[PDB]
């Protein structure tokens, strides 16, 4: 991916995370917990759904028979029809392949991006009270209980509250 | 101590392609190329006509196999492989153009053209067209000399289209299996048929002689047609070897014509048809039949094109 | 204390679509599908011919409505709905092919073919073709027997193309409104017309009899044509029912032919035309008329496709 | 957007910024000021203009009449023409829609990117003398007057000059 | 003290285009539009036939220039600009359709149709078709009256196709350079030729008279053809002015037919051909010839489309 | 580029780096050295090769002659053929141009991305023992010999080893 989060600085995914697409894994005095992030999960899902919405949208263009499988039409017109049909088939086969390749590149990149955007949001939240491990983890200097961790996930963590001890705990 | 950011994954991921990589694994993906065929003609909510033994062009002239379809109404017309337009052997001029017209016609209705005859018989018949016995095309009159080898008087018959829609007018030129048969049916001498309207003009002469037998016959009846505009008049002038129309055909509305081997099914609904049945799909592409008609996904050469619906899968 | 990074915005943003989202708002956007039609034929800097009552094929044979266009030069040729090719009723064989040739011809110039006649009249005329009185096609000669019911001598006329460009050669076959009229114009007996060149050969016979009246006439004159290569010779051999060319046509250069209802306007400049006027645009796509000709944007089904020319709009 | 700057960590745009596309909003002892960034604004504009340049570039391919609205052509050829025309119309309609969707995705993403690139340039400039708020603002530890702020905008701010007091003002 | 991150570069970078910028420089790039033509027909691993002076249709009837190609097998058939189908002047009806059939035929094999003649000569000849002296089409018989101005008896000849593949059947109608010549070759009176099979019927009459000279001749022989289904029978009935087939043609398999000015080269291998030679390429696009055939890159209007194969080049 | 590394915060490329696509340039007590990064170089190369692989993949669709350069076919069919051929040529010319433009944008962006991803990997590695110059260089506080530098390149540098002196050397 372009952002190097998924299959990058984050070594692998969690098969146990069955609650969402992106999530948090925390360690404190009271142990370990894993929770899904709703907003990021929903952003990715909705983006992909928008792609599906665009692709399953049918055209209402009718086509009629131009030739005949039971009794062969005149060859002069027959040869032109066949040439034209083969040319159109080549165009659509090319179009389909290119569409799906572009969509797939971008789908992987947008999902990678969304992972990156969540990581970055957390880093900015933990202004100076923590630093980056490098495998997508934040080592928190100050002690941070289940309620402090929930404060990070619910996006209300107050940096200046725990500032003092964290920076002292350099 | 620590808070970690991550993403979901699965052991059983799905391969897709991108611009940069072939067979990259993702958490979920959906197929964009339809491969599922329904081996039926799904006709729910449509008035269908299953022509069976009746060839579509046969509906206009009426060999015995088309007696039940002389006037038909449909929005889906199904031609079948066993369909035959004729009984006495021959062919329609410009046949595929007429098929294209009839396929989208909504069906046909018939009206008498008002021709009556004196000085000739009207009841030409053949074992090739069987009802209770030897018979002929229901919509046509096989005109003959009153007696074997008798004089066929020079005749002229005219029909004006007084409807607001064009009339489909059919006539036949009979090529006897021999000169002796021609002279017997119509009397000796050169046979000439001339047909005109305001904008159409053509002359015809039979070339009698033995063709290979079809339906027991070595002669041929070749059919010609025109679409007669409102207020235009078609004139037939002839001295024999002429198969006259008794009735004209009028188109009823709109329809889709298909060719299919598949069995009718009034329970499933569909819009895209082909020889092998119905393609029922919301996908933009299909790899079933490049000649499918109606409202269809676009035909592509590829078997599969998987659209990624998830992130890269990293177990 | 603080420095903040940001971006511009507006309250009145414009909706666009992306691969991922329908109707996302952006600061600015431009339309890519042309909907603006000019209800004129914009002809600034072009030599135009507005045919009006003259049908394009009429220019080659010269019914009275085409007297002013017998020799014309143009790079834009406009056919009009009231255009009529004929005066005495009939049709051109392979008519649309000839129209396509004439549309891109750059116009036509005429040259006498040098035919002179003895033993027949040359001044056949009809009330269907009116000038000061009953008249005929200006470029053609209606050849008749010297007297009512008189003998029409077997004749042969030949024209060699001695120019370095192909000659357009037209002739007519006259179908009289009755046998009695045919015998009167040309004398009794079978009429045969044969035409050949080095590579062309065809024979013609009239089928006389009453067609529906057009312009008061129940006969028909059907026109046939060929392009005669440099140094090739066309030969006409006939005994009546023959409408002879007096002059041949030569193509002048290059042109675009259009069909339009729209009024000429010498003040606006344009390159893309259709029935309803001129499409003047730099956009790649248009939704005005799928049959527009000249140098045109590509026709698409959609009404609008907005191209984003700004960032996402966040008020 | 892929970079999460526009409609992301930057909550909204400034309707008052009528001087450019991207800009600076500062607060110091002497009050508040807002100024446009020329280079970033010009980068985005020029990129978008390049897209327009590509799209308004006409082809010089002529087309001629193949059928006739006043007198219907023969049906055998007529049916083929219609089938071919309808097929080509489908191709172009598809092409146009796909083009505009891809262009629009990328236009939004490049504009988002440009915002991100400017933010990041500033962060690297303010090496250790400031930290990230999280709503696209930099809280400067040392006092920074109008001329110091202009030094950031004109891209000549000397980090090591104000280093001492800023880091002391942790 | 310090560690720095960077990337490679070069002074001599290559320009490419993107959606956003024209002529951006990158470290490396590759061309996607083929401009390299090989001025040869690369035929390695293919059975070729270089027709030279022999026109492809000539192979079926056998003017002297086609004597070496009366039965040929090929998977690549090359038509040449000097190719001529005929010796005595004339043309094939529906000629391009027959060329398309022969181009993909894999070649042809011939079989005698078994016609023998009594009461007429079989040895019509002309200086237009030269072997040791005046001669004719090798596969055909120029049938004539036993003596100058003699009676040509009404005749009928029939051939049944007893093979499992269709038979290509050719016949000719001779248009004499004058009535006097027609009466001399075939006797006086009207000449009529009728041809039918189970599904085909047509009648023919010569129009004698002087055409411009080709190969010294003012007459013409026009050739007609049909594909005769297995078990179908073709019947010819005639009283003169008839060029009869001696042998029927059968198609051998599959082939590609090309038209080329380029010299054969058995050493290079190729799949895409045109007038000027062979396009040998793995690129998806080509700008050499829009009418190239075989397995080819797609023709595009552009001269060059450079695909970036490196990062932006910043010296 | 979207990531602003190449032709962005990295001022220019190194013509001397003939060993790879991305690399390291270091300065210490023992002098200067330049080495290529294999993984990043290989990632970019392989991505681009994947694009080439897709484009040189031939179709096996045969076309046959539909008209004739030695003897002109009938004009009715001839005009339709020409109209159809011109329409198909327009479609393919459009397709080719759009393909190459999209591929080229993305190729530049992925190469820019790869540069960014390597820079970021190093920054996370040098947790607190160094800070960002701004021209793609890391000023290392602690002294770092050739073996310490190699430890960065081979991706085994221990942050907590040199932590003490580096942070003291603020
Ligand atoms: C082996 C072979 O080729 N045999 C043919 C004969 O088939 C052919 O005679 C025709 O044979 C028919 C069945 O095979 C049938 O018996 C034909 O008779 C009828 C018919 O039913 O079609 C009898 C009808 O009474 C007659 N109708 C009228 O005359 C007017 O209503 C028709 C009509 O004459 C023909 O259909 C017109 O073509 O024929 C029988 O003629 C025989 C003569 O052609 O030649 C043998 O070689
Ligand atoms: C109601 C109905 O159908 N009536 C037709 C008559 O229309 C028709 O007679 C023709 O009527 C014409 C106007 O309607 C016109 O009067 C025809 O006369 C002329 C003509 O002007 O066309 C007179 C010319 O002198 C004559 N020219 C020559 O003979 C040589 O220059 C031409 C010429 O004979 C014809 O145009 C060739 O078709 O005719 C008049 O004939 C009538 C006979 O067909 O039949 C009625 O039923
Ligand atoms: C200047 C001009 O137009 N001259 C023509 C003459 O060309 C033409 O006479 C024909 O001239 C031919 C060479 O130019 C050749 O001599 C024709 O004679 C032959 C032939 O070789 O083709 C002689 C054959 O013996 C004869 N074959 C038979 O009769 C049966 O085998 C053929 C045959 O008659 C024709 O090919 C059929 O068209 O002709 C010679 O006829 C002359 C007569 O048309 O008219 C001059 O104006
Ligand atoms: C135009 O293209 C169509 C294909 O859409 C060609 O029709 C196909 O022709 C082939 C060969 O004649 C048919 O295959 C053959 O089938 C018969 C009987 O089943 C068998 O004897 C042969 O071994 C072979 O399998 C094929 O069925 C047929 N397809 C369709 C859909 O009709 C057609 O020939 C082309 N037209 C021209 C003028 O080239
Ligand atoms: C090929 O497609 C063209 C469309 O491009 C078809 O031409 C269209 O035919 C319809 C139906 O005949 C015309 O609409 C009708 O107009 C008449 C008179 O205005 C009216 O009586 C009917 O109620 C109906 O509105 C339509 O005008 C015409 N369009 C054009 C541009 O000519 C054509 O029929 C198709 N050809 C074949 C062989 O299917
Ligand atoms: C359909 O398109 C083809 C092009 O693919 C047209 O064929 C081209 O016609 C032009 C003009 O007749 C030919 O150019 C001319 O060549 C002759 C002799 O070399 C010369 O005298 C003229 O000055 C001019 O250069 C051109 O060679 C020919 N191209 C091919 C490939 O055959 C064709 O006319 C079009 N058909 C219709 C019906 O419009
Ligand atoms: C046909 O002729 C009658 C004659 O009165 C007229 O009422 C009708 O409107 C005409 N229809 C057309 C289509 O010309
Ligand atoms: C036509 O014939 C004359 C006869 O001398 C000759 O000068 C001219 O070049 C010929 N033109 C063509 C096109 O064959
Ligand atoms: C043709 O007729 C013979 C007659 O016995 C038969 O064996 C053969 O199978 C028939 N072939 C076809 C193709 O109908």
Author numbering:
A (entry chain B), D (entry chain B), F (entry chain B): 1 to 170
B (entry chain A), C (entry chain A), E (entry chain A): 11 to 141, 143 to 158, 158A, 158B, 159 to 263, 265 to 276, 276A, 277 to 324
Which sentences did the original study use to describe this structure?
Infection is initiated when the hemagglutinin (HA) on the outside of a virus particle binds to glycans with terminal sialic acid on the cell surface. The vast majority of IAV use a glycan with a terminal N-acetylneuraminic acid (NeuAc) as their receptor, although some strains use N-glycolylneuraminic acid (NeuGc) instead. Sialic acids are bound in the receptor-binding site (RBS) of the HA, consisting of conserved residues (Y98, W153, H183, and Y195) and the main structural features of the 130-loop (residues 133-139), 150-loop (residues 155-164), 190-helix (residues 190-198), and 220-loop (residues 220-229). The high NeuGc content in horses may explain why equine H7N7 viruses are the only known IAV that bind α2,3-linked NeuGc.
To elucidate the molecular determinants for NeuGc binding, we determined the crystal structure of the HA of A/Equine/New York/49/73 H7N7 in complex with its receptor analog 3′-GcLN (NeuGcα2-3Galβ1-4GlcNAc). The electron density for the ligand 3′-GcLN could be fitted well for all three monosaccharides. H7eq binds 3′-GcLN mainly through NeuGc-1, but the interactions extend over the 220-loop with hydrogen bonds between Gal-2 and the main-chain carbonyl oxygen of G225 and between GlcNAc-3 and the side chain of Q222. The NeuGc-Gal bond of 3′-GcLN in the H7eq complex adopts a cis conformation, which is consistent with our previous findings for the structure of 3′-GcLN in complex with the A/Vietnam/1203/2004 H5N1 Y161A mutant that shifts receptor specificity from NeuAc to NeuGc. In the H7eq 3′-GcLN structure, the 1-hydroxyl group of NeuGc-1 forms a hydrogen bond with the main-chain nitrogen of E135 and the E135 side chain makes a salt bridge with R144. In the complex structure of H7eq with 3′-GcLN, R193 forms a hydrogen bond with NeuGc-1. The overall RBS structures of H7eq and A/Turkey/Italy/214845/02 H7N3 were shown to be similar. Despite these similarities in RBS structures, we found that H7tu bound solely to α2,3-linked NeuAc on the glycan array, whereas H7eq bound exclusively to α2,3-linked NeuGc. The WT H7eq HA was previously shown to bind NeuGc on the glycan array, and here we showed that this WT HA also specifically bound horse erythrocytes and tracheal epithelium. After the introduction of the five reciprocal mutations (T128S, V130I, E135A, A189T, R189K), the equine HA still seemed specific for NeuGc on the glycan array but started to bind to chicken erythrocytes and tracheal epithelium, while binding to equine tracheal epithelium was decreased.
